[PDB]
Symmetry: D2
Subunit: 362 residues, 4 copies
């Protein structure tokens, strides 16, 4: 048996999604003739509170388009977090493709940036010609590398006040924005109100196979089209993909709460083991991610043992469960939940974790 | 009734394709865990005679990845045609994204480049440090802007001899490579043998909704992966799209011959009208495209009249056919055939053309 | 004896220039505290009829700054000539540094672009989002590769009318602008009136060791400063160089006429030889350059023989003159005059040419 | 009277330098025909222990060329300090020109990078294709923003061991490398032994008006030539500037010690005042810079008062000294010494500082 908690991107299409793709009404999106893509873009615009949206192949391209759309001036700068996904896991595309300078600030704690450090940075070269012009403050909600932490609304409000005062825009990587809205029990628009543009990903917790989009004003999306075209994201009959994304958008408020509960149950379960090797504070499990601190064992070996199966596992547990995880830091692993991990899969992953921990107990 | 000959990208998925998408076995392609994508990449590699292939969202990204993969040296240059699709209809991405210099040579005649001009250009800065280093010769087969002209094998052989002598690679934009192979009645590999890398598009004549790929050696595709990632083409469960592309690849040798026949029938039909306004040489209709020369009427108005319907059309023709076309040059329009244009649609488009021509006859 | 006609860049500083450098009042130009640089920028602004000017190290950087200043929009395009210096002999910097697309048009004939082809190109993607936006028309006066041909004022007037109608700017590479003004016997401002920005080079015919500048409006030069800084052209005590440039600017109207006369004398002299190997039309020698057509001998060997000295040369000529020249095309060489080539040096170069031609006469 | 301690770039040429420029033997450097430039490049290569050197207009271009020379791979990364000059005061050229990603690490303390953080960063994506490839570790000696701190030899040795193990090169911004060599009383080559390439600036403490250069192997300088050309640093008769740089290179070991003594005298003098507003630890004044901590007064106003002159200054001091300084941080100012600040100017600047401090004493 397999329980894959490496990422929520591994979500596979359900039967309602598979039917929607085979029954999609499509056209050439490059000509603006795909009705299902237009339906997705209009519904997502209403959900996010933006004027327009633009369907793209990946959330990577959506972030890259947004940065290029705000930071067009030669000698522009993005203020972002040093552990945000754009700065670490996107090939440095801000530089090698957008040609924009990046100024990273510490964000590990709770995915938030120190408002004092952010103000000092926004003021350093706010008018001096010797410094690059900060045209964008880049935010990520939820913050992936911090464990799926939720950015509060008031923090988002303070960032926009600080950015819009120094003549900068605000973009929010909302690759897991619905995970944040459900955690706060607020409509997603309340978070997007405090930003100029937003990314939104269907291929993670929502369960769609392919797709993301850029949200913003008409003018910003108007120029996002040319950038999508130049990067090679201007597909033809994309309504096949948008049909599946429409299904996941409707099931979001019902599917995502179960991912948060399963992650919280796992964190509480690991805590109830009182192991001197693994330590988790369930109060830090805000969404679908659990960061487990490891001691005395390299995190890679913990993932290797949890993925392997032994005859003694079948003895003291009963089942043979292969738990898939990623080593995150030098002293921690990361578990991500999604709709293909059932609550019974979660209990089985807890039992595998008990067995592995016991077989190496100091 | 609608007969859309603007482009072969408007092909809509058939029932076999719609079923394949709903029945696709998928995984995360970013982890290399989608079996249907791997099946498409292996079959296409055997079809094209390359070591590996890499599925991408669009043929635009496939060309951009190839140029970036060959022209990485700072101060690199691409030798290409001044009417090739990359140089005209791709937002100048060779420059604004790849940062590579372009040297266009005349290609309008038959999509071919003068081998003397190509040799003189390859020799100008072949060793001088004052000139950019030519690292790629860019070819397009079939050539779109010239009317779908087929590049002969011997011409491809001479280009590689000239390019590989001066230390340059050869990439072939094969957005309509199967249209060329069927026209020559040869396996597609015979054309790809004379190039280092190749693009291949499923979303045109093959009929798939979304998808293209890069073909080449293992090492070239190995680095194409990082470039696909940075540009935002690294999708997750792309096996949904690759399932439809596998169907069109199997129906290619049976679907494309009908597109060439319908285009040839139309060109002969227009010729049998002997109109002093429209003139076509059917000998120039090598694939699925027909360039119609217009006189005394702006090509935009000809497209407007062919798209419109009048009561007199219903009189002298019987049916109300809306023929969709694009104005190509200042004195010509362009018609492109595909599997959604039936042979009976072709005859109806001929009758609409007769009516329009007669109602403005000088 | 050496007569170096390879280029007019080989001009060495005179005693008045050497004194001006040692007596220059200088400061930190980066702080705007060098008075001699400010004096040069103000005098050149009055000479060219622009609002401001910005001293730069090379004419290469001046052209690169101008292109970057006009073509900042992502997906911008420059319309230029396929034999202009920017497109051929500047490492493709428009692409690898500015990230701008280039659309070259034929200019070899007389350094001019066909106004019909220029209008058809400016109209192709003037409003379509599928094409790059043409934001600059790039002109070169005098045109180097064509033999120092002068662009007429009326042609410059027609280009601006055509460019400013389609929302594009006009930049003029005036690396040899004074050579054109003296040829037309008009103030240099009459040429710059028909452009938005201009380059101007002191290190060629004017005789300065180092220096060039960008001319334009206050706002354009204001942003040219940031670009000069980013490229590494923001020098400190540049008044040392600007002092020598001020001397050459004052001697221009007296030094350059002698270069045109010496070149014209050489062209007439070569014609009076009636050789079936070398042919020049003196009517094509508009400035300080002479293109000599060669037959039966590779142009490289002609340069080798003219540079070499034999005992038979000392016999039938009397002196041993080493004439330095560059092979230009496959059938032509290029001679460029400057202030370090005296009129007596010109006669000696004619005699060397007679001897070489006679010793291989068919 | 003026005492300008804003920067050491304000050094003006001396009479020996002014004579050297007027007596320089020059040629076209673009053709490699300037003997004085070749003399400077050979002497500097012997001084630095590198194979070749390449004269450039500014130290900004020298750093930009080096980064571009090492980080050519698409998706390359530079590891540097977040307060190094390249990352803060160079328009973000690593991004907007070189297209390279930057990973800044904390360096403020002593200009050094934590070897553990540097190892963790070099190991994160050392082999993973999901991360950019670190091809350069960027060091600055002396570190400007930290107060001219000297990087020890052993630290340089440990950085190269760590960088060369993970397949990265090491470049050292030696804008003030001679200030470090004199401080350590070691030949400059001992520092350059622990790097692959080096920058070296003549226009600061050495006193030359214009000039810098890149040092490295033959192959690295060979490609630096093409990059210098593309950026517009390929000057013609640069031997005018190289003659002055040769004079400053010979006077370095005699001029720079006086700048360190004057700075140390000032730091001790300010300390002997025991003011609760200004505080300096003379042990932190390693070279020609003094960072003065300010309290109760914004650093801009302290610079304003020290620059202004009052009748009460002429009373209690005797002279009217205008001390020029830059505000550095929110709580500190920065003073930089050079050969145009005499030791008697230093004492006068101390007396002005006493007067200003006393007139606002809490």
């Amino acid at each position: 048996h397999m329980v894959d908690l490496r990422s929520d991107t591994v979500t596979r299409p359900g039967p309602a999604m598979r039917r929607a793709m085979a029954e999609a009404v499509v056209g050439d999106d490059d000509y603006g003739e795909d009705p299902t893509v237009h339906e997705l873009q209009e519904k997502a615009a209403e959900l996010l509170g933006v004027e327009r949206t633009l369907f793209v192949p990946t959330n990577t391209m959506a972030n890259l388009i947004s940065v290029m759309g705000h930071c067009r001036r030669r000698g522009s700068q993005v203020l972002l977090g040093q552990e945000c996904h754009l700065h670490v896991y996107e090939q440095g595309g801000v530089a090698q493709i957008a040609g924009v300078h990046s100024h990273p600030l510490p964000d590990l704690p709770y995915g938030t940036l120190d408002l004092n450090e952010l103000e000092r940075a926004l003021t350093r070269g706010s008018g001096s010609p010797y410094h690059p012009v900060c045209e964008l403050v880049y935010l990520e909600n939820t913050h992936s590398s911090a464990g799926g932490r939720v950015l509060p609304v008031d923090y988002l409000r303070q960032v926009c006040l600080l950015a819009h005062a120094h003549g900068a825009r605000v973009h929010m990587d909302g690759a897991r924005l619905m995970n944040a809205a459900v955690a706060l029990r607020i409509p997603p628009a309340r978070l997007v109100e405090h930003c100029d543009s937003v990314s939104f990903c269907f291929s993670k917790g929502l369960g769609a196979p392919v797709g993301a989009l850029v949200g913003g004003s008409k003018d910003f999306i108007g120029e996002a089209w040319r950038l999508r075209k130049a990067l090679g994201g201007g597909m033809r009959q994309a309504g096949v993909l948008a049909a599946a994304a429409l299904v996941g958008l409707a099931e979001a408020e019902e599917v995502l709460p179960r991912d948060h509960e399963n992650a919280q149950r796992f964190a509480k379960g690991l805590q109830d083991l009182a192991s001197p090797i693994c330590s988790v504070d369930p109060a830090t499990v805000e969404t679908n991610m659990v960061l487990v601190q490891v001691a005395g064992l390299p995190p890679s070996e913990l993932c290797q043992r949890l993925q392997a199966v032994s005859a003694e596992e079948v003895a003291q547990t009963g089942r043979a469960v292969r738990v898939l995880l990623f080593p995150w830091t030098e002293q921690s692993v990361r578990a991500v939940w999604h709709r293909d991990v059932s609550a019974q899969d979660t209990e089985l992953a807890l039992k595998k974790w008990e067995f592995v921990l016991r077989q190496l107990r100091p």
